[PDB]
Write a protein that binds this ligand. Sequence first.
Ligand SMILES: COC(=O)/C=C(\C)CC/C=C(\C)CC[C@H]1OC1(C)C
Ligand SMILES: COC(=O)/C=C(\C)CC/C=C(\C)CC[C@H]1OC1(C)C
Ligand SMILES: COC(=O)/C=C(\C)CC/C=C(\C)CC[C@H]1OC1(C)C
Lengths: 268, 267, 268
Amino acid sequence: EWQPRTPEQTLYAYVRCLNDSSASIEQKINWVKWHPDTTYESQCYVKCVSEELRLYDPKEKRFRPERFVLQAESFFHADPEQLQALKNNAEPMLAGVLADNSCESVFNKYATFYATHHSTILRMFHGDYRDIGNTYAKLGNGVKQIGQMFVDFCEKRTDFKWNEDNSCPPEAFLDCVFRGFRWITEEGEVNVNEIRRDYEAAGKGAADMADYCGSVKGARQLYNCLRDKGADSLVAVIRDRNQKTAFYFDLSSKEEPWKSAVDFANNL
Amino acid sequence: EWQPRTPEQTLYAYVRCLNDSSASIEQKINWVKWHPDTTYESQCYVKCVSEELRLYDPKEKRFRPERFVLQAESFFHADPEQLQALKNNAEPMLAGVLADNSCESVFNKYATFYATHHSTILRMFHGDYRDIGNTYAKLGNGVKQIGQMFVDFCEKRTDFKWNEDNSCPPEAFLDCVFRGFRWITEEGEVNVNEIRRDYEAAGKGAADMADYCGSVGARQLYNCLRDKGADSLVAVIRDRNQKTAFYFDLSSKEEPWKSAVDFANNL
Amino acid sequence: EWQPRTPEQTLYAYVRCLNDSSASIEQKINWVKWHPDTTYESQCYVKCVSEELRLYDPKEKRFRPERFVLQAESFFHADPEQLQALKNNAEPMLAGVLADNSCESVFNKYATFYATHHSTILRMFHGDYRDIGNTYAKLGNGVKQIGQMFVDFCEKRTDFKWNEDNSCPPEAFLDCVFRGFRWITEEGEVNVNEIRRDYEAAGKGAADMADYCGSVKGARQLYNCLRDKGADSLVAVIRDRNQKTAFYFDLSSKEEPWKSAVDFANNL
Ligand SMILES: COC(=O)/C=C(\C)CC/C=C(\C)CC[C@H]1OC1(C)C
Ligand SMILES: COC(=O)/C=C(\C)CC/C=C(\C)CC[C@H]1OC1(C)C
Ligand SMILES: COC(=O)/C=C(\C)CC/C=C(\C)CC[C@H]1OC1(C)C
């Protein structure tokens, strides 16, 4: 069952959709201030973030209004009347199967709801840093914290110490790590493009990696398949990606769009 | 010396006292909204929670008003006038030795103070999630966090890595773990009913466990249990440890848990 | 590049400068209420805290007004007008080379800026516990938490498990630990007085320790030199100091000035 997005999940989606975009910096600054315009790159950013958070379902070609409701119930406590308004409006404003999954169709379908509940949506998806302390303390060690690496988070959650050794880790630990890396998707599928990307960035992208274990289509099975193509390489790749999971971006960066993003979120 | 209750200590008391009660879900929903009525199960819930937090002392048969004062000085910063009202009312409203420790006697003694300072008591005992970030950050790694297991917390606190093997752990680590499990009480006594509970839940309950070391310090308790089967002891610790992460599921849609979260989120 | 001071760095400076002072408890109580007076002991405390936070540079004999601005941009979100006022006043009020580094010279240079912006300064340097949750959440595991020991923090930050044995630890881990102990200063220099103090506090002071490795050039160089004077002794000192890094003072203490410090920071 779809759970309310944590700040780890929203930050992952915001940052990854930003870096996958070739849009201008001025456009990306508008996005981190929560007002994407109607240009194609902005429409595709909204579609990307919506899909990554599983708010838009491309198989059914539909927004999932009930997930916006569940997000508001968990994370919007600033205004009971605005909470009830979102509950009443979500289904009528977001209902309907779209003719296609184009960025234009998804953005246009979202537009009325987004305009009507702008400040509520911003807050419930962790856009306002006045809430950041309460949000991370309510979730505690149930969410990966800013600056915490995913392997450490998964080791604690499963009560398992991983020595980067010959031992065979428990399936619950592997599942936690691979889902944090998005090697296994939220739906449980193998994400071979992500695996290949991390192998290549670690310098382990070789021809005898073949399909990167896309054939396996279970966390144990993926781990066993990758380890059989080179155990030392697999440890190296996991370590390399792990370091990059601590800070999705630098909250103290003075480069754009990061500086504008933090300034906006800090002073609402 | 009694220290102001952490959110770990209050959440432990609230949940354990709820799960010990046979009251109806409708009653428990009222309790997690801080609205105990006067039925017997409600009176016993209030007594249970007060005793677990060491606010009511059954050996002396009295509330400890100075402990409510200390809790307010630590965790109530929202209204200076309501803080001073509580400090001046606690002793006159709560002091006095009771004729017995019955649920009715404890609840009735608490009633005027609770009615007069309801919203202050709620907030200073971590009932208002508007404060949850400041409270857990001020305590830091000094308190077990939501979702953290007690063994991890105790390993960090004592700078000890436990390999769950044949090593004999340092006493400060054992004391920390046993007190987190409430195998050793706040007063330092062995809590045999909790040890037995955890052995049975792990499938390691046996007749050779005998008295579960009631005859027995944390080193003494550890040595006594390990002498009855070292592998069983590790299995029991590991099984209870998994249960110390989330005292209840804050995402649960079952009652009373769903009402507990919605109320505390939206004051 | 100088980074905005974390609450770990401000608490370290506040506590160490207090315990270094022989001033009376009545004076120290005024200091923890952000009310230094003009006595020599108070002037010296302000200078000590300013140097420890790298806000005053004794080598160039000047305050660094731009570092106050950077601190305010990071940690003061309560009043745009007071933020802008601080930004405009920092350089005119604080810039200028002093004739000497005396307590009187540093305090007098700081005094007008402080009298003018004291409430904003308090807040941006972590003096108001209404902010404490948001601050530690936004920094996350990138800062040592209250109650956390420095070796643990440094193990997680570098993804290294230290077994306190024969192993040769990675340099990034050594640098993190030594800098947290202030054995290596923020400028990268060996702090021999701090090393000797911790050796003595652990009962490992001895004539063979000689200059306590003040001669060396690098965290690896300092570690190799200390280990060569006695490996077991070095582990014991690290373990002893590590215990003391969890709680810089007892936030539940009823002794002064600790009690008034907590009382003041809680009820602003
Ligand atoms: C570091 O990057 C960001 O902070 C990015 C931000 C704040 C972009 C937020 C995302 C949007 C404005 C896209 C639409 C938003 O309504 C959803 C959650 C689809
Ligand atoms: C998960 O369960 C809860 O949230 C339970 C709650 C909020 C019950 C709180 C306890 C009481 C209303 C009992 C009386 C309370 O005054 C004390 C701290 C004795
Ligand atoms: C535990 O000790 C404290 O709480 C100490 C405090 C609050 C002292 C704060 C420091 C000063 C008043 C010195 C000047 C301050 O302006 C700077 C940051 C130089």
